[PDB]
Write a protein that binds this DNA or RNA. Structure first.
Ligand SMILES: [Mg+2]
Length: 421
RNA sequence: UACAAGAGCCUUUCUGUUGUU
RNA sequence: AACAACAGAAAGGCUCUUGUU
């Protein structure tokens, strides 16, 4: 159970501070964002009732959020140009298309949601596919009784939804594989509630762009009922590779794959299909174009108040397969309950990797998750695959067959935007 | 709908065993 | 083999309560 050193997280701003995570979580005090966005225009969308969420309390939340953000290196310049109340899921598309066609260069819409409602599903469906926006929805309990960590997490998600980098790793502390170009992919499938013959399954992959890996793009399609494999995975990887070359202008050499949402009992069939699928992904672009292929499937399955595993523990043997390159990583502290050391499986190893380098890469990727200043259980790309699969699940909702992947196809503006996080 | 948990609940289902014929 | 009801695991469904410096 080797606890790897957490990455000395590189922040920016006037100080260029470096955050060292202590016990798996680092504070955001006196740390400006590395690539923070000067937020030109932003919007406030209240769906909570005015009885239980007042204008003065919303303005207090806006002011204190702006203070936390200015301390965070992501400045919001002035009061929001849009601050409207609303209600109902059916009143989302007209209001969103009203706010798009009023403020040019619109960046972020903050949406206030009283708990669980179809308003979240319609808000995400309008923002990510129909119109092409970036939104940040938060509950009512976090806009009157707010904490510094709540506003910090809000600012963390807002900074990454708007094209910037919250925090790079150390370029001197990054693993040596970044000496050559790399791309990191993450895949996940969402199945509907069973007995739904008309509701299909969702296959979603995401891919990293830059050599300072904090930016991802998505590609999602719709597949048949209860299918744990992707048919057109090769087209997904090819489109992601094209987008890599288009947005970064340097030729990739390595390929990493982080498969998620796959049952344990039938790993061999999924391996057999998707490995060959990534192979025809590589050989259907140019002759002799072979990157180093590796396939890692990851499956979400003292210290602190709860007394749990410190964030960063790596297990390489004694519970693992001898010949197969599989290992466990527990990279999240136990806030309440127990922490679950994640399982990681690599059979395709032509990417030729040392072990310790590979769990260092996955641990720094876990730290690269942008929605919290703490390491998370499974890496950032497979998280973003999970949230984009759940996002397409919110996209395929009411308020065909497999010709409904026009409803899970992301807009052109948002196809670059890290909207799922 | 920040992160990490826990349980019960009834629907097709993955590993199969037992069983009147 | 199928057979109504099964023992669980794993993936996928809810719902809540357990807190941050
Ligand atoms: Mg999943």
């Amino acid at each position: 159970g080797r606890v790897l050193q957490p990455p000395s997280i590189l922040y920016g701003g006037r100080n260029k501070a470096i955050a060292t995570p202590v016990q798996g979580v680092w504070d955001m005090r006196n740390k400006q964002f590395h690539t923070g966005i000067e937020i030109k225009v932003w919007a406030i969308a209240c769906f909570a009732p005015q009885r239980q969420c007042t204008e003065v309390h919303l303005k207090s939340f806006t002011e204190q959020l702006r203070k936390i953000s200015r301390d965070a290196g992501m400045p919001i310049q002035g009061q929001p140009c849009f601050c409207k109340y609303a209600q109902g899921a059916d009143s989302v598309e007209p209001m969103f298309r009203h706010l798009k066609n009023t403020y040019a260069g619109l960046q972020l819409v903050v949406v206030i949601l009283p708990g669980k409602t179809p308003v979240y599903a319609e808000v995400k469906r309008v923002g990510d596919t129909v119109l092409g926006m970036a939104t940040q929805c938060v509950q009512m309990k976090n806009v009157q009784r707010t904490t510094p960590q709540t506003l910090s997490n809000l600012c963390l998600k807002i900074n990454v939804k708007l094209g910037g980098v919250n925090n790079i790793l150390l370029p001197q502390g990054r693993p040596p594989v970044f000496q050559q170009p790399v791309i990191f992919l993450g895949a996940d499938v969402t199945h509907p509630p069973a007995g739904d013959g008309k509701k299909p399954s969702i296959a979603a992959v995401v891919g990293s762009m830059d050599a300072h890996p904090n930016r991802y793009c998505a590609t999602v399609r719709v597949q048949q009922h209860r299918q744990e494999i992707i048919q057109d995975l090769a087209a997904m990887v090819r489109e992601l590779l094209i987008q890599f070359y288009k947005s970064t202008r340097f030729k990739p050499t390595r390929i990493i794959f982080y498969r998620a949402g796959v049952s344990e009992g039938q790993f061999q069939q999924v391996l057999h299909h998707e490995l060959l699928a990534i192979r025809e992904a590589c050989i259907k672009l140019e002759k002799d174009y072979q990157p180093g292929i590796t396939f890692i499937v990851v499956q979400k399955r003292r210290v602190g108040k709860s007394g749990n595993i410190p964030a960063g523990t790596t297990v390489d043997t004694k519970i693992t397969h001898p010949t197969e390159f599989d290992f466990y990583l527990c990279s999240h502290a136990g806030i309440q309950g127990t922490s679950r050391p994640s399982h990681y499986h690599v059979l395709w190893d032509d990417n030729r990797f040392s072990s310790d380098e590979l769990q260092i890469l996955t641990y720094q990727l876990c730290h690269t998750y942008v929605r919290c200043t703490r390491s998370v259980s499974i890496p950032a790309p497979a998280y973003y695959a999970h949230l984009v699969a759940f996002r397409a699940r919110y996209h395929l909702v009411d308020k065909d067959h497999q010709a409904l992947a026009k409803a899970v196809q992301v807009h052109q503006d948002t196809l670059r935007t890290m909207y799922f996080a």
